[PDB]
Amino acid sequence: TISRDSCPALRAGVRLQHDRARDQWVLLAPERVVELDDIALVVAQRYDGTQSLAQIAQTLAAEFDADASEIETDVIELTTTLHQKRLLRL
Amino acid sequence: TISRDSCPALRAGVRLQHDRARDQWVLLAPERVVELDDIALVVAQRYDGTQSLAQIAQTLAAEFDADASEIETDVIELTTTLHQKRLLRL
């Protein structure tokens, strides 16, 4: 966590900018790349802000003749990672 | 938190891309803008991956003839927010 003992540095590509037109200063964060492999590729495509992870897992497990409990764990794990990376709307 | 009941959607600008050259699929996250105002502007400039938040607060409070306890709270609050946004290296 962040405490008084933290010694931060801005990450690479994160730069300070004076947005004169809007009379404000901002930090510009660079575009990011997140690798998706195998089933994660399908899950990312299946997100639609409606279906739940449970539904997504049930659908995929049935489509791939895979175990639903296992797929649900994988779907939740992936979503947690993508959520941590600020890539999702819940 | 993320559970089986979550119904995610990819955020705007987050798109799926087939990086054929690297034989992988990825999610491309768009550049982001984070507003910094008043003392937060100075704090962001003071980060150097060496000085601690305690040191940064002590320095700034002395420079601005402000109360150090108050400034330390503000510095920690800001850093926590920037850390949550994945903008810092600790």
From Swiss-Prot, chains A, B:
Record-level GO BP terms: pyrroloquinoline quinone biosynthetic process
List the InterPro entries: PQQD, PqqD_bac, PqqD_sf
Q: Transcription regulation: is it a keyword of this entry? A: no
Kindly tell me the pathway this chain contributes to: Cofactor biosynthesis; pyrroloquinoline quinone biosynthesis
A GO molecular function for this record? quinone binding
Tell me where on the tree of life, at the top rank, the source sits. Bacteria
Q: Which UniProt keywords apply?
A: PQQ biosynthesis
Pfam family for this entry, one? PqqD
- Subunit structure, interactors included: Monomer. Interacts with PqqE.
Give a short account of what the protein does. Functions as a PqqA binding protein and presents PqqA to PqqE, in the pyrroloquinoline quinone (PQQ) biosynthetic pathway.
Q: Name the family.
A: Belongs to the PqqD family.
Q: Please give the name of this protein.
A: PqqA binding protein
Give the species this sequence originates from. Xanthomonas campestris pv. campestris (strain ATCC 33913 / DSM 3586 / NCPPB 528 / LMG 568 / P 25)
* Chain's gene name: pqqD
